[PDB]
C-alpha cells in the first residue's frame, strides 16, 4: 500500500555544470602508461546535468520521472544515506518487466520482475524520541510480483540510518548502461568536504557489476529514504541530500593512464578544437604551431530528381471510354506503344468493380517501364 | 518456444562439453560460423547465448547470417559476423501431433524488418490498407502472427526441426565458460605455449609485479598484444638474427 505525497511546493528544475566527470573503463583490459583513444557512450565534458534537492528547511521531495535514452550518470551527495536505490522499466504498471535496486541492510536485493509500481515509491526510517535509535519503518515501492525468475543476494552490514548534522561528506558516482542484453552498473565512492556544490577533480569509475538481464528500459525513478518522528499520507521529513542526473552520448575519448591500473586523466575529442588537436596528436601537450585536425563539409539538405515531362500520353481514354466495345468472341486488341502512361488511371474513380491486378499489382511497379501494352 | 518468441538462456560460470554435441551426430544441421567445428569449438567465450525455436525444415537456411526470408526478417535474424553455431534436428515424433500441432507460430507479416536480435511479442493487427481496422481482423488487415501446423505424415520440408542457435561472444575478458581440457601443470620461466582464456600463443611465463583489478583478467601493452594475463606476465622467449 502506497500513500500519495502532498504538501509539496512546486519549484522549477535546477541545473548545474559538471566538470570533466563521468568517465569509466571502456573494457576489462589492463593498460598502463598508454594514451588510449576509444569511442563509447560517455558523458560530455563541461556538460549540464539536472540537479535534485532534498532539504528539511515544502521539504523539496524530488523523485520525478526521468528518461533513459542511452545510459544515465547518477551522482549522489549524501551524509545520511537518503538515496537507497533506483527502479527501471518502461511503464512501471506491472504490464512490462521492470528492475529495482535497493541497498537493504540485510541483503542487497536487485529484483527483476513485473511490479505494480505506485505513484510515489519511497522508503521511510522511523525516529524514536525515547532513545537515540533509527530503524527502517515503511517500504512502499511495489504491490505485486508474479511473472519473473531473477532474484539475487549479497552481504551488506548494518549501516547508520541516522541523520547527522552538517554538510555532505560522501559522493557516490554511478553509470547504468543497457546494451547487448546487459545492464552494466559502474560505481565509485569518494570522500568530499563541500556543503552544496559539485566536486572537482577526476576519478576513475570501476565496474561494479554487469547484470545479464536484457529488458527494455525507457523510464526510471529514484528511491529516497525519508524520516518520521501527523497524517501519514501528507506528513514526512525528507532529510538533507542531493543527486545529479546526466545522460551519456556516443563520443570518442582519449584516456591517459599511469604506472598503476587506474585512469588518471581523460579528454573529450569533440569538446573544443584544443581537445580535438590533442586527440589528433595523441598527446595531452600541444606544441605551438598549426595543425590540420578535421575536415569541414556541407551535408546535403535534400535529394532532387528532375526527369523529362509527360509529353506523349497513352490513349487509355480511347480504350476505356470508347462508344462501342467488342463482343467476347471477337475480343478487340489495341497496342499501347511509345507513350508515357497515366498509371494513376484504373480505381480513383473506382467505378470499376475490379482493379484486381496480377503480378504487377496497383503500385509504383505499375507506373513503370513496360515493353508492350496490350489492351 | 516458438520462433517469434525466441527463448534465450545464459550459459554462465560453467565448463562446457561441446564435444558431446559433435559426437552425437543426430542433429540434422550443426553448422558453425566463425568458430571451427570438429572439436575446435571448446574455446572460452565471455557469454554463451542459446536461443531455441521450432522452425520448418525448409526455413533452416534463412537462419544463417546475411540471409533473407520471412523468418529472417520477421522472426529471428543473425548478425553478419555470427561467431557461433546453428544447430537443428528433426523433431517429427516429438513436435508433430495427430491432426496437426498449432502451438508453434511464425510472424508472416510485420511493418518492417527487425534488428539483428529482436523479440517482438506484439499482437497488433498488421496493416495492409488505408483503413486502420481498429485492431480487428478486416479487409487489408490481418493478424500478423500466423500458425505452422506440423502434421505427423508430412514432407521433411514441412516437419518440425528443433533448432538451437548458439552465439559465442569472443571478447573473452569475463571468461565465464571454458573447456575442461587444459590443466595448470605449474609451468613458469620457460618457453611454453600459454593458454589462459582460450587465446593461444607462445612465450615464457614470468612472475608479475603489476597490480590488476578484480574485474580485470587480461593486460595489453602498446601494439594491442597480450602482455599480462590473470597475475602472470607474458614475455616471449629469446629470438634474434644470426
Amino acid at each position, epitope marked *: 500500500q502506497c500513500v500519495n505525497l502532498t504538501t509539496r511546493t512546486q519549484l522549477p528544475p535546477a541545473y548545474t555544470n559538471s566538470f570533466t566527470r563521468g568517465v569509466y573503463y571502456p573494457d576489462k583490459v589492463f593498460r598502463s602508461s598508454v594514451l588510449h583513444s576509444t569511442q563509447d557512450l560517455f558523458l560530455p565534458f563541461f556538460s549540464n546535468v539536472t540537479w535534485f534537492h532534498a532539504i528539511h528547511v515544502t521539504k523539496r521531495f524530488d523523485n520525478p520521472v526521468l528518461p533513459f535514452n542511452d545510459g544515465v550518470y547518477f551522482a549522489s551527495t549524501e551524509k545520511s544515506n537518503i538515496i537507497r536505490g533506483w527502479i527501471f522499466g518502461t511503464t512501471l504498471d506491472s504490464k512490462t518487466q521492470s528492475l529495482l535496486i535497493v541497498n537493504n541492510a540485510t541483503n542487497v536485493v536487485i529484483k527483476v520482475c513485473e511490479f505494480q509500481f505506485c505513484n510515489d515509491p519511497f522508503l521511510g526510517v522511523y525516529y524514536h524520541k525515547n532513545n537515540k535509535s533509527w530503524m527502517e519503518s515503511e517500504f512502499r515501492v511495489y504491490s505485486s510480483a508474479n511473472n519473473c525468475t531473477f532474484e539475487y543476494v549479497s552481504q551488506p552490514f548494518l549501516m547508520d540510518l541516522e541523520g547527522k548534522q552538517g554538510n555532505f561528506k560522501n559522493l557516490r558516482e554511478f553509470v547504468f548502461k543497457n546494451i547487448d542484453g546487459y545492464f552494466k552498473i559502474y560505481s565509485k565512492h569518494t570522500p568530499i568536504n563541500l556543503v552544496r556544490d559539485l566536486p572537482q577533480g577526476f576519478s576513475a569509475l570501476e565496474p561494479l557489476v554487469d547484470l545479464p538481464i536484457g529488458i527494455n528500459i525507457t523510464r526510471f525513478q529514484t528511491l529516497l529514504a525519508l524520516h518520521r518522528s501527523g497524517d501519514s499520507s501528507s506528513g514526512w521529513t525528507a532529510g538533507a541530500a542531493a543527486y545529479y542526473v546526466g545522460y551519456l552520448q556516443p563520443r570518442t575519448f582519449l584516456l591517459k593512464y599511469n604506472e598503476n591500473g587506474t585512469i588518471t586523466d581523460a579528454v573529450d575529442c569533440a569538446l573544443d578544437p584544443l581537445s580535438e588537436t590533442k586527440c589528433t596528436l595523441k598527446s595531452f601537450t600541444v606544441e605551438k604551431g598549426i595543425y590540420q585536425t578535421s575536415n569541414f563539409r556541407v551535408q546535403p539538405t535534400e535529394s532532387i530528381v528532375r526527369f523529362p515531362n509527360i509529353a506523349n500520353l497513352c490513349p487509355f481514354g480511347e480504350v476505356f471510354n470508347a462508344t462501342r466495345f467488342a463482343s467476347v468472341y471477337a475480343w478487340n486488341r489495341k497496342r499501347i506503344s511509345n507513350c508515357v502512361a497515366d498509371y494513376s488511371v484504373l480505381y480513383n474513380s473506382a467505378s470499376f468493380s*475490379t482493379f484486381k491486378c496480377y503480378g504487377v499489382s496497383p503500385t509504383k511497379l505499375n507506373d513503370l517501364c513496360f515493353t508492350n501494352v496490350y489492351a | 518456444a516458438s520462433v517469434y518468441a525466441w527463448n534465450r538462456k545464459r550459459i554462465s560460470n560453467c565448463v562446457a562439453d561441446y564435444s558431446v554435441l559433435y559426437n552425437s551426430a543426430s542433429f540434422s544441421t550443426f553448422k558453425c560460423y566463425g568458430v571451427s567445428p570438429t572439436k575446435l569449438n571448446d574455446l572460452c567465450f565471455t557469454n554463451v547465448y542459446a536461443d531455441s525455436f521450432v522452425i520448418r525444415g525448409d526455413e533452416v537456411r534463412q537462419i544463417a547470417p546475411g540471409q533473407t526470408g520471412k523468418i529472417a526478417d520477421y522472426n529471428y535474424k543473425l548478425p553478419d559476423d555470427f561467431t557461433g553455431c546453428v544447430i537443428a534436428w528433426n523433431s517429427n515424433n516429438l513436435d508433430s501431433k495427430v491432426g496437426g500441432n*498449432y502451438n508453434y507460430l511464425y510472424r508472416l507479416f510485420r511493418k518492417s524488418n527487425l534488428k539483428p536480435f529482436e523479440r517482438d511479442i506484439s499482437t497488433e493487427i498488421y496493416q495492409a490498407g488505408s483503413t486502420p*481496422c481498429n485492431g*480487428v*481482423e478486416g*479487409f487489408n488487415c490481418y493478424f500478423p502472427l*500466423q500458425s505452422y501446423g506440423f502434421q505427423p505424415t508430412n514432407g521433411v520440408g514441412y516437419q518440425p526441426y528443433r533448432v538451437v542457435v548458439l552465439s559465442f561472444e569472443l571478447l573473452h575478458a569475463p571468461a565465464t565458460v571454458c573447456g575442461p581440457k587444459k590443466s595448470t601443470n605449474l609451468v613458469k620461466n620457460k618457453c611454453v605455449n600459454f593458454n589462459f582464456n582460450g587465446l593461444t600463443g607462445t612465450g615464457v611465463l614470468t612472475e608479475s609485479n603489476k597490480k590488476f583489478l578484480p574485474f580485470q583478467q587480461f593486460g595489453r601493452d602498446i601494439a594491442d598484444t597480450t602482455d599480462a594475463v590473470r597475475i602472470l606476465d607474458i614475455t616471449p622467449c629469446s629470438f634474434g638474427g644470426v
Partner: antibody
Amino acid sequence: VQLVQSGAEVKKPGSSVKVSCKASGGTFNTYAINWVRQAPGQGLEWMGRIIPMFGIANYAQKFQGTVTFTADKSTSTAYMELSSLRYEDTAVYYCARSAYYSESSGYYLDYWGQGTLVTVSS
Amino acid sequence: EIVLTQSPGTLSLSPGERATLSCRASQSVSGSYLAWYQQKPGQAPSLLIYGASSRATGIPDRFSGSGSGTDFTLTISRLEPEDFAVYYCQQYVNSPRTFGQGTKLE
C-alpha cells in the same frame, strides 16, 4: 464443434452477470470466439471477439465499457461479463467461432452456441 | 461504418419458388468479405456461405451466392419447406463485423 451455452439468468436490473460458453477440445487455440447480441425481436449485433491464445479482446464502439470478455485457457471456457443490467440490455447472447488469421481471411462465425436469455427476471 | 440493407424484407410470404435475397452496402464490399446465415426459429444462426459464393459443409449447393462489388445474392434453386429461416448478412470489410436486418422474417 460443440459450444454449449450457459442457462438463462435471473438478473434484477443493475445486477451483473457472466455467461459461460464452453469450448470443445481444440477450439480456443485454433479459432477466435465472437459475441453477438441477438436482441429480442430484432437483428444480430457484433459485440466483439475473444482471441483465447493471446488474450486479446476488441469491442465495437457501442458496447465499449459496458461488457467484459474473458476466456480461460485451461478448461476451454468462454466468458462474457455484463457491467450491470441496463433496461435495454435484455437479449439472447450467442458465442461463435472465428478465424482471426491471415491465410484464411474469411472471418465468419463457424459454429454458434444455444444462447443465453438475460432479462429483469428469469 | 458500412451499413447493410437487405432489400426483400418479406418477399418470401411462405415462398414456393426460387428466391433472390439481397444485401447492399454504402462502400462496396472489398474482396467478397461477406457471409450468409440460417437462423431457424428458436435456434442459433448457421453459416450458409462465405466469400462471395463459396458454399458450406452440410449445406447443399442449391444455396447459391451470386455477388460481386455490392455482394447481394442468396438463391434457393429448388425450395424445401424445412429451410425456411430468416437469413442474415455480415461484412468483414472495415465494419465491426456488422449484420443486416434479416430478409426472411415473418
